[PDB]
Amino acid sequence: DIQMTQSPSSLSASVGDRVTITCQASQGIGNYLSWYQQKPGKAPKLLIYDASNLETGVPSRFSGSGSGTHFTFIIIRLQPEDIATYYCQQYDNLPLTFGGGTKVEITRTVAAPSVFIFPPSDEQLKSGTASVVCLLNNFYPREAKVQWKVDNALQSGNSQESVTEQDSKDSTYSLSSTLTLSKADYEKHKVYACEVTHQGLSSPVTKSFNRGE
Amino acid sequence: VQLVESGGGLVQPGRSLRLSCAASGFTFDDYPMHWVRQAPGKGLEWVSTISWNGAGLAYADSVKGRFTVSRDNAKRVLYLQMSSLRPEDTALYYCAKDRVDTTSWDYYFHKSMDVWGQGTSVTVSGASTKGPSVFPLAPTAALGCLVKDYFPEPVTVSWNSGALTSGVHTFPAVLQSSGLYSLSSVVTVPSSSLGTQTYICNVNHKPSNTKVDKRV
């Protein structure tokens, strides 16, 4: 069986930078390698086949080269819509095998997250639980620390996060934090605060509500 | 050229499942076809390949003896009969077209795959199906829906019955402590269009008949 060793596993480069992805076959596959692009939430697409042939419609900034055991995939000038995970695949011999993939992300300019707060809804409070939602929207870099303050008290172990994949147009992320605790506790307190730490925040921004206004 | 996978769902381990791939827009019986799967967060993994006729089969070792590839050339359907299902068979299963109309069925009826379907999701688990509660996220202007406590993934979330796509963020689901999933969907609209614009989120969780449209 032929392993495809793909490197790097992940990279991040500025718009217009050169991206170089290599795929190694443990054994000679000659010409029979292809490169697929899988954008977030989408299915793979053929970009390159037979190691160097540029599939219909795909732009000239994509190029492939190699034979035998070594193959090179290059994006000559990286573009924001190139956010994807790229896969090499050999079809010279059974079993068909893929590379581990390579996540490509844009390193873009510092963007500040516009912060939003949402209290638990009327419907949800009926069901004896309170989910409090804080929306971190359209920021870069991805690193962002959000702390939950209930009556000004640091909650630990009470919320979970969820970040989107990088946007193909402005190269930003977006974050959701959901502080979950019982309605029994949601009545024991009044001021719920969402504190956000980020590079693009001049001063750490908090968003808070009073219970029902 | 279109490929449409179907038949994915929640199966208990050891049971059987059949996925179908409806091919259209090309002479389907001239080409080999492929099955490729993808565990959530993980890479592409090849499952099976069948020649243009039914006479040439190929399987990854993970599935040899458990899965059977087959095709109906009159129906233009590629099949994948999965039996003795294991929890590590959980993946998104892709139908894929071979780029080359090879007539051979003994060797090398496999080249680059130029057309892929959007996949059908298979979850192998003995856990109970649980439909979601859909709560609103009430309010430039930001709004959305909260889809809490469902199993299994996926749910589909549609805004303005598919019309409003601009500025939508449907976050990846989070596997809570209970073993039930929860995600949030938000979209940014003008406060200029807050009044005289009723906003609708469309949550469908097919493993149950939970098709909800809720106002924001």
Added chain:
Amino acid sequence: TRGKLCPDCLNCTDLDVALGRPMCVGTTPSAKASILHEVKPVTSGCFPIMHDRTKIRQLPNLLRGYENIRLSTQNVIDAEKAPGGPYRLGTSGSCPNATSKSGFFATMAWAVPKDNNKNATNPLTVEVPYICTEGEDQITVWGFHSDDKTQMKNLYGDSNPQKFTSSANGVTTHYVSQIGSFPDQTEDGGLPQSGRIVVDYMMQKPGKTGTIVYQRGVLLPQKVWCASGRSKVI
């Protein structure tokens, strides 16, 4: 003086060139003197042939005896549209050329049915026209593929023996195929194969037509040999 039928056909035996093996198609110059360097001519690849089921090994030495030999430019019949439902031109991973890991002999076309398989067929007749130049001898290469019981029913709608006959110049051949229990593969591409092919030739003298009567698995002729003159073989 010619030794090999096709010089510049390296890694090709005389029988490879006579069958039109991929990579073994090229100029076969004229020669008035020839040496017979193979008593039992041998193939060095492709799909495996049960050679000694027919007279096929004499084909290079028959071509050797002509002054002029050349492979025809056009196909002697349209194989895909031949009687027996629509056909696909079968290829095999044992017969690669420079741009494909699969292929098949250029002298023949592997008639593989297309969901008209299910219909096993009563014997079908195709006429093989004379296509060489006015005074030339035409040597028509054909045969049939057979396989084991399960694969015969998968490729074709029949697991029973198929029967094949040819007729030209008052000479008739007749065959019945074999299902399973095949001889070992020899003189072939070196990949395991559950089936084999039997390859034959028939001569059509100037202006004479040919006839092949067949069933499932037929290898219809495509490129024929156009030969003329007489060469002193030693």
